[PDB]
Structure formats: C-alpha cells, structure tokens
Amino acid sequence: HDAQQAQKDNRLYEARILKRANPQLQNAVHLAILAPNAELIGYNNQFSGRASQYVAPGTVSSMFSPAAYLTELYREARNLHASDSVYYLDTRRPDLKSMALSQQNMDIELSTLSLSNELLLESIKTESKLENYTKVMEMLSTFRP
Amino acid sequence: KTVLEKSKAGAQSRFDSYGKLYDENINAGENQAMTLRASAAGLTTAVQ
Amino acid sequence: KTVLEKSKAGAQSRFDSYGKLYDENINAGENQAMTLRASAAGLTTAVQASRLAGAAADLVPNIFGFAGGGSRWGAIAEATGYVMEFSANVMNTEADKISQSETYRRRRQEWEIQRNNAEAELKQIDAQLKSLAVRREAAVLQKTS
Amino acid sequence: ASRLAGAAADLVPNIFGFAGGGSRWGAIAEATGYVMEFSANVMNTEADKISQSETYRRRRQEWEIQRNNAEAELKQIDAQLKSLAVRREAAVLQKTS
Amino acid sequence: KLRIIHNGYEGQKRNQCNLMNKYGKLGDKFIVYTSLGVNPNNSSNKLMFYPVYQYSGNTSGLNQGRLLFHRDTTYPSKVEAWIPGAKRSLTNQNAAIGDDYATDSLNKPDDLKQYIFMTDSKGTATDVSGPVEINTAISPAKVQIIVKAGGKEQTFTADKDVSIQPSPSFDEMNYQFNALEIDGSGLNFINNSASIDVTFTAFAEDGRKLGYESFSIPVTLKVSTDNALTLHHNENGAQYMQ
Amino acid sequence: ELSQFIGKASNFGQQEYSNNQLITPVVNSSDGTVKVYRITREYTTNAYQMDVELFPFGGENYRLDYKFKNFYNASYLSIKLNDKRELVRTEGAPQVNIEYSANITLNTADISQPFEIGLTRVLPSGSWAYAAAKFTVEEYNQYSFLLKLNKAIRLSRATELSPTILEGIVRSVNLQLDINTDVLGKVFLTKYYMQRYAIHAETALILCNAPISQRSYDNQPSQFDRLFNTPLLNGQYFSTGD
Amino acid sequence: QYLLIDNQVSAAIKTTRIAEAIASIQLYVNRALENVEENANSGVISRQFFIDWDKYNKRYSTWAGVSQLVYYPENYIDPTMRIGQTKMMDALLQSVSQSQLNADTVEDAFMSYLTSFEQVANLKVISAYHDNINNDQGLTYFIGLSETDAGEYYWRSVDHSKFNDGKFAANAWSEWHKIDCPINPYKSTIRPVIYKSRLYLLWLEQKEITKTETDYRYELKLAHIRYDGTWNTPITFDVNKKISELKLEKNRAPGLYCAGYQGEDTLLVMFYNQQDTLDSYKNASMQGLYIFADMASKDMTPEQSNVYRDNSYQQFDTNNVRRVNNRYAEDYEIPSSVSSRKDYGWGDYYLSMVYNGDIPTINYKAASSDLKIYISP
Amino acid sequence: QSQLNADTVEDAFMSYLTSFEQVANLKVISAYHDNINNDQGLTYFIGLSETDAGEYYWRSVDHSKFNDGKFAANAWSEWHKIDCPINPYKSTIRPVI
Amino acid sequence: QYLLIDNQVSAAIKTTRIAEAIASIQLYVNRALENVEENANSGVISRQF
Amino acid sequence: IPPYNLSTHGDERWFKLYIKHVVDNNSHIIYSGQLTDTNINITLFIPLDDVPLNQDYHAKVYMTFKKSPSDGTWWGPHFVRDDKGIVTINPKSILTHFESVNVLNNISSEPMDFSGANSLYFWELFYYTPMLVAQRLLHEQNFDEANRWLKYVWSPSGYIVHGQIQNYQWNVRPLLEDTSWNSDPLDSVDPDAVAQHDPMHYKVSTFMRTLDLLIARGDHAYRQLERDTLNEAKMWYMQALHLLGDKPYLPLSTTWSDPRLDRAADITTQNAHDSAIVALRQNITLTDLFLPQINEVMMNYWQTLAQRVYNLRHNLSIDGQPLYLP
Amino acid sequence: ANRWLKYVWSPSGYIVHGQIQNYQWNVRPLLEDTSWNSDPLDSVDPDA
C-alpha cells in the first residue's frame, strides 16, 4: 500500500509542477498562479526541458495522445502472456514492437485491408524464405494445395 | 426519382416510429405508475 | 434555386433544433424535479419509526398520585392509521415520479420523429436542388440551340 | 420551529394537586413525524414548481421553432415573388414577340 | 501592533521585491530600476527583465555586488546586461528560470546608475532605466504611530514604546507597542460621538516612506441628562412615543 | 508560413527539416561570424525505405543521421558519396526505426554541387536493399541570407506561390539562386497558366520548361513520385538513371 | 482473432497505424482477460491497469478523459452540483432552479441557505465515542445539538489515521448528519457507541412520578441507524433500580459508561456515581448490564462489573472532565476465528491445491509478558 | 424513473436492504398446526419486528412438502404483515385456524 | 488595443463619430479598470462613476 | 525557520518542529515542512496544561533537520508562563536552530481555518455557494446578476472598501492564500477532489466562468444585430480577450523523436522517470517521455473569440453568413 | 449495467482482496448449482 501511495504522491508532485508551469495560466496573468522556479528548474533538469514543452492536442507527442494510450496499452498488455507462449503479443504481432510512434502513423489513413495483407505477406515471405513480395505471388500461383 | 425516394424514406421512418409506439402501447413505467395509484386506493378497508 | 435554398434552410433549422432537444433530453431542472419526488417517497421508513415511537410512548401512564393512568389505549391503532395515510401519499408521489419520467420519454420520442422529419426534408430538398441544376443545364442548352 | 416548540411545551406536567403529571410522553416523536410529513409536501411543491418552470421553458423552445418555420416561409415566398417577377418579364417579352 | 511588509506591489515591483527578499537582508542597499521598457528593435516579444542591483556590504558582504534579475521564459539562455555609458557588461551563462544574477566584476556604482540594456538574444530585450538607490534598513526610531483625538495630538515611537526588539527580517516586521496613554479628553463629541484616529506609519533610514495604515476608534458618549423615551396611551386611544 | 520559409527551429537549439529544407546559423569558432547553411534534400531512390539527414558543424564537417523504415538482414551497412567514397561503414544489420549517426567530412568540391548519399544494406547472400538522397549544401553570409529571405517572403506574399514553386522557378531560370526579370517573367507565366488552364502550379512550372521535381513536401509525394510512383507496378519503384 | 486484424474487411475501410495498433491490443487484452486464451498471467491481470479496464482503460476516450481529469479538473467541475455537497447546498440548488432568477429570488434563497448554515455552524458537541482500542487508530464519533428546546441531535465523525501532521486533514472529517429519533436525554446523559459495526445511541431519560411526594424514574433508551440512513425506534431498558442503587445526588445524572466489546459480542453498559477524579473510581461499584444484538438484556454481576471497571475506569467521566470511551478490551484484540483467506495458490501443474481450509478457533494466553496464541486450524 | 445514475441505484438498493433486514431478523413468537397430526397439513407462525410496538408478521410451512428430512423451499410462504394494533402481555399470542 | 479604433475592420462597416468616440473611451476605461494598462491612477477608478 | 544552507542543514531540506513536556514528556510533532531559500514564518498554538511538568519551563519547542535530526538538552525554546498569563522564553534556551522566536501575548484568538473540521461549511459559504448561483444565473440569461455573483468570488478590477481599492482580486481567502483542502485526491475519480487538493484549479474554474459570462453577453448583443449591439458585442469579446491575454507560443520542433513503441513502452524508462520524480521530491532515456498538453478548453476559448471577432470585422452573422446581400 | 451484471457473473472472474479467485459465478447457489424447487411442472411458470 505504501508503494501505491508513492505513485499517487509522485503523480501529485509531477502534476503540480506541470500544471503551474503552463503558459496558458501565465499568459492570463490575473490568475496570479505561482509556478515556483526552484521546482520547475529541478524538474526540467531531470526531464530535459520537458515541462516547458507543452503541446497542442492532436500531436502524437502529447501525453494524452493515442500514442500515449498505445504506449500504455502495449506496456501492460505485452506482459499478459509468457514470452514463450503462442499467445505472446510480440509473437502474434512483432510489427508492434517495430512500429514507431510517428505523427504520420497517427494522421495518415490507409486501407485496413492493406495493413492486413502487409502482415500476412511479410509473414509468408519470411516463412518461405523468399526475397520479396513478388516471389510470394509467383509462388502462390502454382501452390495447388 | 431521387427526390421521391427521399420522400419515401421519410414516410417510412414515420410509419415505423408510429407503428412501434402503437404496438408497444403501455411501457413498464406507465404500468407501475398506474399500479401505484391502484394500491393506494385499495387501502380504504384497512384504514377503516 | 434560391427558393429551394431558403426551403433547405428552413429544414436545417428544424433539424438542428430538434436535434438539440433530442440530445438534451432531461434538463437539470427536470432532473431535480424527479429527484425531489423520489426523495419525498423515501421518507416512508422514517415516518413509520416516528409513528411507532409515538404510539408506544402514549401507552405509558401519564397521571400519578391518588388517581392515575390516563394512557392512550388507542395509540397503536391511531399510529397505524397514520402510516397508511402516509403510504397512500407516497404511492401517489412515486406514481407522479414515474409518470413524469415517462412523460419526458414520450416527449423525446416525439422529438425524434420531428428530427427525422426535418432530416428527410433536407435530403429531399438537396435532391430537388440537384434536379433543378439539371433542369438549368437543359435551359442553357436550349439557349445554345 | 413551531412543531418543536409545541413538543417541548407538551412534555411539561400539566396536572397538579393530589394527582398529577399528564405530560405527553410521545410529544417528540409526533413533532418529528409532522415535520417529515410536511417536508414531503414541500418537496412535492418544489418539484411541481420546477416542473412548471421547465414546462414553460420547453414551451418557449417550441415557439422559437414555429417562429423560425414562419421565417423560412417568408423567405421562400419572397424568393417565389422574385421568380414570378422574372416569369412575368418573360411573358411580356413573349407579348412583344 | 504595527506591521511592515516588503513584498511589493503587483507587477515588476513584486518581482524586484522578491529578488531583494531572496538575495538580501534587511540592512542592504539596492539599485532599483523603475522604468522597464521593451526594446523596439531587439525584442521578439512582450516580456521584459526585472533587475535589482545589490551592493556588497551594508550587512551582507558580497564580492563587489550582484545584479539580480527575474526572467519569465524557461528555456536556458545567456543573459547579458550591457551598458552603453559604462562600456561594460555583466553576464549569466545558462541563466535560471526566474531569479538569477550576474556577478559584478567591479563595484563601480557610476556604471550601474545609468541606462542598461538587457537581453538574452532570444527575447526579453528590455530597456532598463530610472535607477534609484534604496536603503532597506529600518530603525525603530522611524516607526511611529500618530494619534489624532479631536483637539489633541500625540505621537509614539517604536524606539521608546516597543518592548520587544523588532525582527531583523526583510519580508515582514511586527512592532508590539506598550499601552500608550492617549488623552481622550479633547475629543470632539458631535451627536454624542467622537473618534480617536490612529495612523501607523514608518520611514526607512534613507528617508523612504514605508507607507501607512489608518484605524479609527469611535467613542460613544452616554448622556445621563437626557430623559428616558416613553410610551403613552391616551384615553382616546391615541398612542405615541414621547 | 514561417516553417515553409525558414525550416523548423526551436528555443532548445534544435533544427528540423521543413519539407526538405534545413537551415542553421552556424557560428564560426574564434571568428564570431555566422554562415548560414541551407541544406536541400531530395530523394532519388526508394524514399519509403529510409530517412536521411545532413547537419553542418562547419569546416566541411557534417552530422549524418539516418533511420531505416524496413528490415533487410544486412551483414553490413555501407553509405557512399556519389557511389564512390564510403562515408560510413558499420557491421551488422541496422534496426527498424532506430536512429543511427556518424560524423563525416565532405569536400568543398562535393559540397558546392548536388551530390548523392546512397545507402546500401548488404545481405550475406550478396544481394542488397538500396535507397538514396540527393543533397545540395549552400552557404551564405548571414547578411546575404537575410536579404534573400526577404525577397522570397515578399514575392511569395505578393503572388501566393509556395516557396517550393518559387525555388523551382529560380532554379529553372538561373544556376545561381537569384531573382531577376526572367524569373518574374516565369512567375507571371506560372500564375497565368494556372489561371488560364485551371491547373496546379507544379504543372504550370513544367509549362515554363521546368524539370519534374523530386522534392517532397508537407504530407505529399514529390511531383516525380505522384506522377510515376503513386501505386508501384508489381512493387517496383520507378527512379531515374542511365 | 489470432493476428488481431481482419482480412475479411472491405478495401474501402481506412484506418491509421496508431489506431490499428490500439484496436489490436484492446482485442488482445480482452481475450486474455476472459480466459478465451489459456494460461494468461494472473499476476499481470491483477494489476490496477487491468482492474480499471472495463471502466477507463479499455477505451481511448475514457482513458484520455480520466487522465485529463487529473490534470484539468476544471474542465469537469460543474458548480451546479458536486460529489459530497451538503444538504444545505441541495436545498439551495433547488431553491434557485426556476427560470425566474433575479436578485430577490436569489437573495431569499441565499438567506435560506445561510439560516441552515448557522444551525449547523452552532451545533454544540455533547459527547463522543472512539471506535478502537487505541487512541490513534480508527475514528471518533461525536454527538452534537441544535440550540432549541426539544431540539435535534446530529452526529459526525473523524478518521484518526488522517491525522498526519499533529493535525487532522480536512478529509479526516465527516459532515454532520441528522438523527431522526425522539431523543430527550436527562442532563445530556447520552453516548454514541459502535456495536456490531453499527452506530447506536444510548441515553438516559428522567420521568417525574408522584408517590404525596414526587420522585424520579429513570429509563435507558437505545436506538440505531438503519441502512438507508433512517433511524429505528428506541428500545427501552428499565434501569431504574441501577440508578436508584447508585448514591446519586438530587441534581445529578449517573455517569454513563458505554462501549462495544468484541469479546462476548456485546454492548457493555455501566452506570456510576461520579467522582471528582478518576482515582476514586478504581474501587467504585458499577451498576451495569449487557445489551445483546437481539436486544436481550442481562444484569451484570458484581464480579463482571468489577472486572470491566478495572480495565475501563481510567476512561470514566469525572465531575471536571468529559472523556471519550474506547472499545472495551483487557489487553489484546484477537479474532475468535478466521474464515477469510488472505491469499492462495495452485500446486504443480495446476492439478491440485490447498483451498477453503480455515482457522475455526483462536484462543490465547496473556500472562504478564507472555502472549501465546492457540490455533486449531 | 429513467434517470438512473449510480447514486440513485445504490440508494434504491439500500432501501431494499433496509427492508430485507427488517424481515430477515424477525423473531418467532408462536405457532399453530392446522391439522390433527404433525405429519399432515401446515404450520402457521407469528413473528415480530424488533421495534417499539413493532409489527407482527405471519407465514406458514407445508408439511407435505417435507421430504427426506428437509422442507422444500416451496414448503414455505413469505412473511406477511399483520396489519392491526396487537399488544399482548408477555407475548401471550397464538395464531389459530 | 492602444488607439482603440480598429484597423482590421472591413470597409463595409459604418459608424458615427460620436459612436466611435464612445466605443473608444469605453475600451479605454475597461483596460484601466482591469489593470491591463498598468499604473492607472489609484484615485478616479475609486470614484462613484 | 532560518533559510536553508546545505552546509549547515544537510543535503535534504527536511525538517520538523516538535513539542515536548506538555501533557506528557514525550516528543510530539507540531509541524512538518521543508527548508526553503528564504526564512519561514510559522505561527503555532502552543497548548499549556494545568500543572507544568518542569519548573524551569512550561513548554519546550525544538526544531530538527537532516544534518541534526536529534533533540538535546536545552535545545529550542523553553516557554514560561507567569502568573499574569504572559509567556516568555527561558534564557537557558539554545535558539541557534531558529531565525527568530516570539510570543504573541496579545493573541487570544485565531483566524478561521479553511482546512479544518468546519472547512466544508466555510468552503460552501464562500466559494461553492456563489459559484452555483452565478452558474444558474448565467443559464437563465440574467447577465447582470451573474456578474454580481462571480464578483463575490473574483474581480479582475478588484474591490472597493470605504472608497479605497483593496490589494487583491480573489475574494475567497483560501484561494488567495493557496490553502490545500485535501490529503489525497487520487483515491477516486473526482475533479473536485483534485481542486480541493490544489486550490489553483478553483481559481481557474472561476476564470473560466468569467469567460463564459463575457462570451455569452457578447453573443447576446451580437444576436440582436443592430449597429450598436454589434459594437457592444465587440466590447464584451475584448474583455474576454483581455482576460485570456496572449495566446501561447508553441515550438516548431519539440524534442520528440518518433521513438519506437518498444522503447516508449519500456518500463525501464518509466522506472527511471519515477526514480527521478522521487529524487526531486527528496531534493537529491527520459527524452522519450510524452509531453504535457495545453488545456484544449482554453484553445477552444481562444478560437471562439477569434471567430467572433472575425465575424464582426468581416460583417458576418454569428453563423458566419454575410450580413450584406450579394 | 455492466457493473450490476458482474455482481452475478464475470467471464474474467473477480479480484477479491487483490487476488483472482477461482470462480465466474458470484452467486453462491449458482456456483454450487443448488436446486430451489420441488416440482415446477405443477404450474406454468418459467421462474419456477
């Protein structure tokens, strides 16, 4: 329980610094919100200037972005099955560990089906030890069974 | 033809919504409200 | 074309107004009114406890000395009578609660019908604008002739 | 406040002499019971008030819609009058022809 | 009880006062700049620096002295205070968020009591002027209460009237006076009321006014010679207040 | 608009390519002068396989950064300049979405003219994966840079043509990146053709005898790729050559 | 299901790569949580992230909502109503809920609120009980009174574990609650107690009876909280003999000692002749009774009385000070038995396990400096 | 009502639970068997809520539903309220048929 | 937010000189009262008007 | 409390005050806190019992800190109450751990505590009560009263008492003083609990309500569509803009590297993150962390006002339609 | 609605005092599968 309290306290500490440091409140001015620099400086020294890097919703880099959501889901979900299991997340979808949290992955839409073919096609190329996807298609053309 | 088809869809929506309401008639809430009024009236003999 | 556009606007206004009402089903005021009726009904158990305590206390002798007693022999019966009268009022209170809630439900259903009627009008009108545009082209060709 | 005051008065012995007492032992319970019953009547009154106010609000909303429907009709009609004026001009040209 | 506060007026005055409180002592002397403009050709923004110069000595030895300043942006930058008269410059490499300072390489007040240009080359290009020398030291001999009481006037001074040596703190001082004997006779009672007006006021060692606070103590005079009000009920049914 | 004209830049001392334009203020140690570096990138082969970036340090030294978008089991990576000089060599296969870098030196002779950095992932089988980008590195006296920027901004503002179009016009007209009346003549024709034929400016440039562009921008393919590589034919990428 | 991506979907349907990865994982997680897929890691499943799967973590929009809530609660706070608002606030909200708002409507509603505020603000604390053995553990319950003749009683409580800096946190405190019970105690002879993990109030009332000469009869009333917040009727216990036995003065109330006792599942009630100081109660004869969960009532014998006294008199009210009674215990509070497991696990290969065993009896020895626990598991 | 939020439901539950407790804890006072023999027919019971002047309740069990040493759940009726002013001395009360 | 007469307003929008003067001053006053424009007189703003 | 000096106080800023020899002879905590760069003025109520447990002094108060966490003989104030009820400090006391110690002999009372037992009621009386009322008035369009009711909590133009402006904008004492009113808001998902913990949020909430009021007044006047109500609308929108002030500047490029999911998700980075937070709390790979986000509600207010002003400048309706026929 | 059904049954089981328990039915008699009638065919009643 103390370990859980430590996380709650850590979140309160971090959130207070990030909240008070917000330029929005400081631009309003009249709010008279103190963002003491001793705590902000310490924080930025440990997080490489991060407290000042506020971003607009919609960027992949936001802590509330779907990339942040994906990161949290992957971090916890990947541990649901043993690493040597048929149901291990990285066994089923190794491209997940590979994929980057890029802004372009977030904004550009593409056929869901093409992603599906990409996965199957790469998996087949790999298992069949073929050079490329056109060798996979050449192979499939005579694969009578 | 397209204009008439949209008209048809409009009428179909109305038809189905009123049909549904007509067929349901009384819902559960309505029955409970009426049940309560009845139970209260029924206390006359106990009161006497 | 202008006439149809004004018609479209009429339908659009109706659509949006009924849309808004449909979504804003229960207003805060409406919610409070329903809440109050439920709260009043909830006093039943407290009322019964007070009436019982009253009646029991009333069975206790009140007069002491060279004459005495004076207890109320009918105290339980009277309290029993009051509880039933209260219960009748409660049943009506709950019935109004339920009826009022359903009244709003049915109202919302009417709004949905009206919303859908407006939506249909927008679609019919858009279709009319397109047939008009075609008619216009024909007039242009007739000018060309 | 009145019910509590009543109950207090009623707990005091009323009969004196060679016999006495006569206080109401149930006085507190009765006062509490009456306050709660009154409260129920108040909650219902307040709820009716609220419902009535909201009813008027909703009424106004319907009126606004009907106002707007009439507005659309006025605009369509003015547009129709312009359409007709054009048609009339064409009829005049046909007469000229 | 008289209370003196040096936190400062909302604005650059607050910023300057915070620097004095964090980097100095009650007995210190400072150069306070009063006019902080925005340089029209060098500023990228509407922000500005809020400098104070602290001299070495005056109860706080320093090597020469320090140019204290407050900056609102948060990215690190080098802050340069350049002076066109003096042909001098003080700097702070990778200056801190908020309060930081440049070390004065030579304490030569003539070079400080003049226009200063401050910038970090990114923004906050500030025009700094109107320097005034401020002595924050205060003797209890200048902490006074002035009592006005109708035809009478009395004054009291913390030096003789305060029993507990006032704190040497800068942010706040509290002066607790012994009961002062105020001559109430002389009060001008009008409509059976008079008031003793007490103003709390003080000065700095350099003559700077520290401001004031005014209190008023009303006195109601009981008039024992006025007849009691009564209620009469006339036999003709007429009721009145006498 | 700021980004389209000057690249991305931040107060953290960080620069990033806008479209394919990187601009930095290189400060010359011991001189204090500034040489503005403008590096333009175009992909010549297989842009979809990898990101390639070049950052000056000055003195013909550059940071070459790269990231691979896909995986081939290379026994080694070899990066070459104009397919002759190996700039970077490392053993083992690079990993996907991992950023790698090396410090390289380019000759002034290469810097001064467009050059290609090719990256080949060589498999133990002897086969390989390959992609490449063309870079041109321009250097300006900071004053020349600011003057050219000023012209570009005012011209774009007057005409609403994108800086990428305007650059294409200038390169089409002259070997040096200057603005003159022939350039303005083409700016007119470019706009005129857009208005007269209801076409995109890139098309209008071709009608002004411009080359097809290999430069990507925003979230768009290069003109070259939109035209020749929207789908790939049987997975095969179309590129130029002999 | 295996690849967490379809292949039977129309080419006309588009997505983003981040979105696909998210959707994929959400399906993955659901299959593991539902045990569709064999041998998932129960350790990981038991983590809070997955506990809050169904609510908050399962969907992006609810996830973002809760995370943002912590950073920007102002986007979620609605002054109209809040969690934990007082009843006075409910009354105010309702009072200004109509459309006809102007200064008169509002000012009257405000003054109505303020009237209630004063009634609460001036409640007088009459008595209290601490639901623990030790002063720093558990929580203290208090009884207060509205200033009217035949007035109303209220109660509130404070959590001692929230005393964190020589001071209670605001969170430590509960709000005042009304007691809907006909309580008319004599000389404030009243105590809250916790018994059977429930709030009970006990009080003594005085009745004047003519014998003429009048004299007084004393009765003990008990009442308790119901699950819906209402109160039950009082139960009357005839303690007149106990009060009579105590040599009380004409203007006194017996001190009322009352506390729950885990041992013997009972409420211990004792009455006493109040002394100036606690030392005088060391050998006082207490007149008590036991109250049981079913309202049975038994006289307490002198032997029992003396024992409870010896272990509790240190907490008895005196003529100079009120005290808060703690839970009665001799020395240690030890469970009588244990049926609730704290933990468990499977044996090798999941073929067998130790499960649903128990500790049906716990006995103990407590001699000076000698604590022994006897377990019959 | 349609506005069922979490709080409403939990309060509705506690109302249910309060009534549950009142019935669950009823004391049995007396009983009568409506037959000649214990083996046939059914037994009626009278119980009491533990409140001041509390309510009396009744229920019964069917002996023909007793099988293999146990009464079937079906054997028992629910408690029913006795709606009258009952006030016996020392619980001297019996149901009779 | 200085001259208190806008410059981004379309030519299609018309007013009178008195009306503009009123609007200008009202904006001025708001800024002084709200302390947008610092070092406003401590008197004046404390007057009944 | 004297200002922190690592060389005299230790690496950590931790310190506590303790009270001893009152009621019992145990050392009890009376105040906990951190050592700041400036000194700290702490006011305590020091209780006294009926009979002193020590003749030389009736109460002991002392302070301990990281470098010197222990108590000792004659350390700290040793208070003495004379028979007139005047309290002083025994000269044998070692006061080197204090900046200053003084007895407030004229203080028999203290300011109402908004963090205490009755904080619930005081917070409703001064903050929630008027915010609720103001919200209701705005919904019903009584703009003038809604203003009055927000002013009771906050006034950007301040407050006038006896014809003089007082030096504050917040009229709610605990907001003005930043008084925390929680212990742990993360026990449940409750926006209010968070604000109770950090009062800053209530200040922001009040501000948002003020903006809502001004925009709504603006829209009302706007919708009337007369030359001068449009001018009035502009006026109201400008006030909302004065309150928001400058729209924030955001960077063209952040330190974000579009890191691989496996790295972003590596709990090692999260552990390192959490470790750094603890070190910060204690005064003792992270470039792949996700960045804090701008409150989008404010972005929506900035955007709303920009659109409203735009429509006025371009002679458009509230819906952006021309007010001028073609 | 989800919460209230889970009090009866959960396909993902339940975490009780921090540990996943070996059951899906949270209703003791369903988990036990204890009969609660003697003969439902004496009437027309799905509950029976």
- How many helices and strands in chain G, by DSSP H and E? 8, 15
Residue J213 burial (10 A CB sphere; 0-12, 13-18, 19+): buried
Write the CA distances from E33 to A42, E36, J291, integer angstroms: 30, 7, 38
Cβ proximity of G312 and G328 under 8 Å: yes
Interface test with J, best of I2, I9, I41 (most J CBs within 10 A): I9
Phi, psi torsion values for C37, nearest 5 degrees: -65, -40
In DSSP terms, F136 is beta-bridged to: F40
CA distance J25 to chain F (A): 57
Alpha-carbon gap, residue J230 to C136, rounded angstroms = 39
Alpha-carbon gap, residue A22 to A29, rounded angstroms = 11
Q: Computed from CA positions of residues G307, G312, G314, G320, in that sequence, does the dihedral angle turn out positive or negative?
A: negative
Alpha-carbon gap, residue G44 to K44, rounded angstroms = 49
CA distance D78 to chain G (A): 37
Alpha-carbon gap, residue H42 to H32, rounded angstroms = 9
Q: How many residues would you count in chain J?
A: 326
Residue F106 burial (10 A CB sphere; 0-12, 13-18, 19+): buried
What is residue C67's DSSP assignment?
A: S
Alpha-carbon gap, residue A123 to A130, rounded angstroms = 10
Give the pair of three-digit tokens for residue F231: 């789908």
Using the beta-carbon criterion (under 8 Å), do J129 and G75 form an inter-chain contact? no
Alpha-carbon gap, residue J64 to J17, rounded angstroms = 7
| Virtual torsion, Cα C25, C31, C33, C37, nearest 10 deg | 120
Write the CA distances from E208 to E27, E135, E137, E203, G188, integer angstroms: 14, 8, 10, 6, 63
Alpha-carbon gap, residue C52 to G168, rounded angstroms = 40
Pick from E172, E196, E137, E232: which is nearest to E8 by CA?
A: E172
Cβ proximity of G233 and H50 under 8 Å: no
Write the CA distances from G110 to F11, G241, G287, integer angstroms: 52, 52, 51
Cβ proximity of F127 and F102 under 8 Å: no
In DSSP terms, E133 is beta-bridged to: E31
Position F18, amino acid: S
Give the pair of three-digit tokens for residue B8: 């048809």
Q: Residue G180: which of C46, C64, C65 has the nearest Cβ? A: C46
Neighbours of chain K (3+ CB pairs under 8 A): G, H
Pick from G324, G359, G363, G321: which is nearest to G338 by CA?
A: G359
Write the CA distances from J72 to A109, G165, J3, J97, integer angstroms: 71, 22, 22, 12
Find how far residue C30's CA is from the centre of its chain. Answer: 6
Q: How many CB atoms lie within 10 A of CB I2?
A: 8
Alpha-carbon gap, residue H86 to H82, rounded angstroms = 9
Alpha-carbon gap, residue F198 to F191, rounded angstroms = 10
Half-sphere CA count of B26, side-chain side, radius 13 A: 9
Write the CA distances from F64 to F24, F54, F55, F103, F117, integer angstroms: 15, 5, 7, 6, 10
In DSSP terms, F129 is beta-bridged to: F121
Alpha-carbon gap, residue E115 to C62, rounded angstroms = 97
The three-state secondary structure class of J242 is helix
Q: Position of tokens 């073609």?
A: J326
Position J192, amino acid: D
Give the pair of three-digit tokens for residue F170: 């200038």
Alpha-carbon gap, residue D75 to J325, rounded angstroms = 13
Using the beta-carbon criterion (under 8 Å), do H2 and B29 form an inter-chain contact? yes
Residue C11 burial (10 A CB sphere; 0-12, 13-18, 19+): buried
Residues 6 or more apart whose CB falls under 8 angstroms from that of E110 comprise E86
Cβ proximity of G239 and G289 under 8 Å: yes
In DSSP terms, G235 is beta-bridged to: G222
Cβ proximity of A64 and A42 under 8 Å: no
What is residue E178's DSSP assignment?
A: P
Alpha-carbon gap, residue G366 to G374, rounded angstroms = 11
Element spanning F63, H or E: strand F61-68
Q: Position of tokens 């002084």?
A: I32
Pick from H56, H85, D6, G151: which is nearest to C82 by CA?
A: H85
Q: Helices C75-144 & C28-41, crossing angle to 10 degrees?
A: 160
Interface test with J, best of F71, F97, F99, F101 (most J CBs within 10 A): F97
What is residue J240's DSSP assignment?
A: H
Give the pair of three-digit tokens for residue J25: 């002879």
Judged by a CB distance cut-off of 8 A, whether residue B37 touches chain C is yes
Q: Computed from CA positions of residues E152, E157, E163, E168, in that sequence, does the dihedral angle turn out positive or negative?
A: positive
Cβ proximity of F95 and F71 under 8 Å: yes
Q: Position of tokens 């000018």?
A: C143
Residues 6 or more apart whose CB falls under 8 angstroms from that of A85 comprise A91, G39
Cβ proximity of E39 and E63 under 8 Å: no
Alpha-carbon gap, residue F199 to E126, rounded angstroms = 50
CA distance G239 to chain H (A): 17
CA distance F118 to chain A (A): 21
Q: Residue F10: which of J253, J258, J259 has the nearest Cβ? A: J253
What is residue G331's DSSP assignment?
A: S
Element spanning F68, H or E: strand F61-68
Give the pair of three-digit tokens for residue G192: 């809250």
| Virtual torsion, Cα G71, G76, G77, G80, nearest 10 deg | 180
Q: Which of residues 200-229 of F touch E (CB under 8 A)?
A: none
Q: Computed from CA positions of residues D35, D41, D44, D45, in that sequence, does the dihedral angle turn out positive or negative?
A: negative
Judged by a CB distance cut-off of 8 A, whether residue I34 touches chain J is yes
Position C128, amino acid: Q
Alpha-carbon gap, residue A78 to A72, rounded angstroms = 10
Alpha-carbon gap, residue G115 to G137, rounded angstroms = 36
Pick from F113, F94, F26: which is nearest to F63 by CA?
A: F26
Pick from E143, E139, E136, E102: which is nearest to E119 by CA?
A: E102
In DSSP terms, G198 is beta-bridged to: G195
DSSP character string of I11-28: TT----HHHHHHHHHHHH
Alpha-carbon gap, residue F146 to F142, rounded angstroms = 6
What is residue J53's DSSP assignment?
A: S
Phi, psi torsion values for F120, nearest 5 degrees: -120, 130
CA distance F98 to chain A (A): 9
Judged by a CB distance cut-off of 8 A, whether residue G100 touches chain C is no
Judged by a CB distance cut-off of 8 A, whether residue H2 touches chain B is yes
Q: Position of tokens 């001699």?
A: G367
Phi, psi torsion values for E197, nearest 5 degrees: -105, 125
Cβ proximity of G234 and D25 under 8 Å: no
Alpha-carbon gap, residue B20 to A2, rounded angstroms = 57
Residues 6 or more apart whose CB falls under 8 angstroms from that of C69 comprise C61, C62, C63
Using the beta-carbon criterion (under 8 Å), do J253 and F97 form an inter-chain contact? no
Neighbours of chain A (3+ CB pairs under 8 A): E, F, G, J
Resolution attained, angstroms: 3.7
Residues of D in contact with C33 (CB under 8 A): 47-48, 50-51, 54
Residues of J in contact with A47 (CB under 8 A): 273, 276, 286, 289
Write the CA distances from H34 to C62, G100, H41, H42, H75, integer angstroms: 43, 67, 6, 6, 15
Cβ proximity of H69 and H48 under 8 Å: no
Alpha-carbon gap, residue G321 to G336, rounded angstroms = 35
Cite the beta strand spans of G285-348 per DSSP E.
287-291, 297-299
Which residues precede a break in chain B, with C-to-N distance above 2.5 Å? none
Rounded (to 5) percent helix, strand, coil in chain E: 10, 45, 45
Element spanning B16, H or E: helix B2-24
Alpha-carbon gap, residue G217 to G208, rounded angstroms = 6
Phi, psi torsion values for J47, nearest 5 degrees: -75, 155
Using the beta-carbon criterion (under 8 Å), do A24 and J298 form an inter-chain contact? yes
Rounded (to 5) percent helix, strand, coil in chain G: 30, 30, 45
In terms of C-beta distances under 8 Å and separation of at least 24 residues, what long-range contacts does G130-139 make, across chains too? G130/G160, G130/G324, G130/G325, G130/G326, G130/G327, G131/G194, G131/G260, G131/G327, G132/G160, G132/G326, G132/G327, G133/G326, G133/G327, G133/G329, G133/G333, G134/G326, G135/G160, G135/G326, G136/G160, G136/G163, G137/G161, G138/G327
Alpha-carbon gap, residue F120 to F134, rounded angstroms = 15
Q: Computed from CA positions of residues B16, B20, B23, B25, in that sequence, does the dihedral angle turn out positive or negative?
A: negative
In terms of CA atoms, which chain C residue is nearest residue G179? C46
| Virtual torsion, Cα B8, B12, B14, B15, nearest 10 deg | 130
DSSP character string of J277-319: HHHHHTT--GGGSPBPB--HHHHHHHHHHHHHHHHHHTTB-TT
Give the pair of three-digit tokens for residue E63: 């090597």
What's the angle, vertex CA J324, arms to CA J319 and CA J326, rounded to 5? 110
Element spanning J235, H or E: helix J227-244
Give the pair of three-digit tokens for residue E64: 């020469």
The three-state secondary structure class of E136 is coil
Cβ proximity of F222 and F31 under 8 Å: no
DSSP character string of G207-241: EEEE---EEEEEEEEEEEB-TTS-B---EEEE-HH
